[PDB]
């Protein structure tokens, strides 16, 4: 209901109040209580200040200002994320009397080793730098009872995972772990069973991965859209493709326009019959027509191979929708291509979504490598 219902320090609640949060978003309602009891957490949820606070709030609750040692280590892959995180930390922990230091690859080692001479309670840093300072004995983690990984999936890749495990060596044998991620698959479970203890798993997203899928956006005016789509049909090697629109009307009109140009295609949407929907679905899976235009695919069937190109004719408003449209279910690196058509009023939704799902939607290049949407 409210943050006050979580029985937190006065100063922490003050911090939240000044920060302007009124009611806890669901990730906070789920994680904040479980975290403040000591239990480990493995959560999947979209990125945001909401989630960052969903773990920063417990951190500020646990750490004792009176003890001048590192009591919480917050690992992040990129420096900008260390910045944003530490910013949320300083904000919410405004009245808590708690020092938060950032230590990354972009910074100077000398200034960081110098900074660590003074009191630091919550350390926020990237794998390399943190392991460096840890090995150096510059950063004392003997009383660091709390370990956190935001965008954890980015740091459990082949190389980083080693560094993470080497950092974890310094932490006390008995320590709390909080692992957060946007994108579903986890590289290893040996890591999990070894380094986590009775973790309370949270999952607030569909089980879909953008792994292997190369994402591009293209700023295209509303009137210029069809021309652009044709240019893509002409310039891209497609065995089969799916187009997405934000309205049934636009779906039908676009499908009919595509058939009018000279490409055989089917269409589906919610306002269509269920039986007819699944019918067109299977018919498309067969490969009768080389394209489909659809508003919704509530029905989920794993990982259709044939499709190699996905296009958002209309950019979605929310990251859930975008994920449902682009995300494939196969845990393994499903190979695909996604092209988004960016309206003037979608420029923000692109920034937001790109951020929430923790993925990269780069500007569409003239020369798209054929290795990315066919093999």
């Amino acid at each position: 209901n409210t943050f006050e219902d979580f029985y937190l320090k006065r100063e922490l609640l003050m911090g939240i109040f000044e920060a302007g949060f009124e009611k806890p978003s669901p990730i906070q309602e789920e994680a904040i209580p479980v975290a403040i009891t000591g239990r480990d957490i493995l959560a999947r949820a979209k990125n945001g200040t909401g989630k960052t606070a969903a773990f920063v709030i417990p951190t500020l609750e646990k750490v004792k200002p009176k003890l001048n040692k590192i009591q919480a280590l917050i690992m992040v892959p990129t420096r900008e994320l260390a910045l944003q995180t530490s910013q949320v930390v300083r904000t919410l922990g405004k009245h808590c009397g708690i020092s938060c230091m950032v230590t990354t690859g972009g910074t100077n080692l000398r200034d960081d080793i110098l900074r660590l001479n003074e009191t630091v309670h919550i350390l926020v840093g990237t794998p390399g730098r943190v392991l460096d300072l840890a090995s150096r004995k510059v950063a004392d983690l003997s009383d660091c009872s709390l370990f956190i990984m935001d965008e954890a999936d980015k740091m459990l890749s082949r190389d980083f995972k080693t560094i993470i495990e080497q950092i974890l060596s310094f932490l006390p044998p008995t320590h709390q772990s909080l692992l957060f991620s946007a994108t579903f698959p986890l590289t290893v479970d040996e890591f999990m069973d070894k380094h986590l203890h009775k973790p309370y798993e949270i999952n607030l997203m569909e089980e879909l991965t953008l792994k292997g899928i190369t994402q591009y956006y293209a700023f295209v005016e509303e009137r210029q859209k069809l021309h652009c789509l044709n240019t893509l049909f002409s310039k891209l090697q497609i065995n089969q493709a799916i187009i997405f629109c934000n309205s049934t009307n636009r779906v039908e009109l676009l499908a009919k326009k595509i058939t009018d140009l000279g490409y055989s295609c089917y269409y589906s949407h919610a306002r269509m019959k269920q039986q007819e929907r699944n019918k067109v679905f299977h018919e498309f899976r067969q490969g009768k027509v080389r394209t489909l235009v659809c508003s919704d695919l509530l029905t989920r069937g794993i990982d259709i191979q044939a499709v190699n190109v996905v296009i958002n004719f209309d950019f979605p408003k929310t990251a859930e929708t975008y994920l449902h449209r682009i995300g494939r279910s196969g845990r393994f690196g499903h190979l695909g291509l996604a092209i988004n058509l960016i309206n003037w009023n979608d420029r923000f939704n692109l920034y937001k979504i790109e951020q929430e799902l923790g993925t990269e939607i780069a500007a569409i290049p003239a020369t798209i490598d054929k290795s990315l949407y066919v093999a």
């Binding site: 005016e221 859209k225 021309h227 652009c228 240019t231 009109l253 326009k257 140009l261 569409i364």
Partner: peptide, 29 residues
């Protein structure tokens, strides 16, 4: 309702192929 269809009648179907790079500069307005 929809605006594009009048905008891009299928039948003429002719233009110098759409250039993305030029519109990517119009990203800021």
């Amino acid at each position: 309702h929809i605006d594009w269809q009048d905008d891009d009648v299928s039948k003429i179907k002719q233009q110098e192929d759409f250039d993305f790079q030029r519109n990517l500069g119009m990203f800021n307005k």
